């Protein structure tokens, strides 16, 4: 759906600043029960990080999904 991707981003962007950071991504994964390192989180971000800022914006997130 389109409204589902909008809702998902809103939930992962902990501070609501418009960007999902590595810390935020690591945080949700850890709460779900994943054991991960910052290196693992970085690889995930590299798969979505188009403009190369190290974080995931809304546009990048939707592409990712
Ligand atoms: Ca954020
Ligand atoms: Ca980015």
UniProtKB/Swiss-Prot annotation:
Modification comment: Ubiquitination results in a strongly decreased activity.
Q: Disulfide bonds, which pairs?
A: none
Which positions carry Phosphotyrosine?
19, 58
User: N6-acetyllysine-modified residues are where?
Assistant: 14
Residues with the modification Phosphothreonine, per the entry, are 30
Q: Which residues bind Ca(2+) 3?
A: 13, 15, 17, 19, 24
Kindly list the positions at which Phosphoserine occurs in this protein. 1, 21
Q: Which residues bind Ca(2+) 4?
A: 49, 51, 53, 55, 60
Q: Which residues carry this modification: N6-methyllysine?
A: 35
- Where located? Cytoplasm; Cytoplasm, Cytoskeleton, Spindle; Cytoplasm, Cytoskeleton, Spindle pole
Q: Which residues form the EF-hand domain?
A: 1-35, 36-65
For the modification N6,N6,N6-trimethyllysine, the affected residues are 35
Q: Which family does it belong to?
A: Belongs to the calmodulin family.
Summary of subunit composition and partner proteins: Homotetramer. Interacts with CEP97, CCP110, TTN/titin and SRY. Interacts with MYO5A and RRAD. Interacts with USP6; the interaction is calcium dependent. Interacts with CDK5RAP2. Interacts with SCN5A. Interacts with RYR1 and RYR2. Interacts with FCHO1. Interacts with MIP in a 1:2 stoichiometry; the interaction with the cytoplasmic domains from two MIP subunits promotes MIP water channel closure. Interacts with ORAI1; this may play a role in the regulation of ORAI1-mediated calcium transport. Interacts with SYT7. Interacts with MYO10 and MYO1C.
Q: What else is known?
A: This protein has four functional calcium-binding sites.
Q: Say what the protein does.
A: Calmodulin acts as part of a calcium signal transduction pathway by mediating the control of a large number of enzymes, ion channels, aquaporins and other proteins through calcium-binding. Calcium-binding is required for the activation of calmodulin. Among the enzymes to be stimulated by the calmodulin-calcium complex are a number of protein kinases, such as myosin light-chain kinases and calmodulin-dependent protein kinase type II (CaMK2), and phosphatases.
The domain comment in this protein's record states: The N-terminal and C-terminal lobes of CALM bind to the C-terminus of KCNQ1 in a clamp-like conformation. Binding of CALM C-terminus to KCNQ1 is calcium-independent but is essential for assembly of the structure. Binding of CALM N-terminus to KCNQ1 is calcium-dependent and regulates electrophysiological activity of the channel. The C-lobe interacts with KCNN4 channels in a calcium-independent manner, whereas the N-lobe interacts with the S4-S5 linker of KCNN4 in a calcium-dependent manner playing a role as calcium sensor and gating the channel.
Q: What is this protein called?
A: Calmodulin
Q: From which organism does this entry originate? A: Bos taurus (Bovine)
The organism's taxonomy opens as:
Eukaryota, Metazoa, Chordata, Craniata, Vertebrata
Which gene is this protein's source? CALM
- The portion of the full protein included here is 82 to 146 of 149
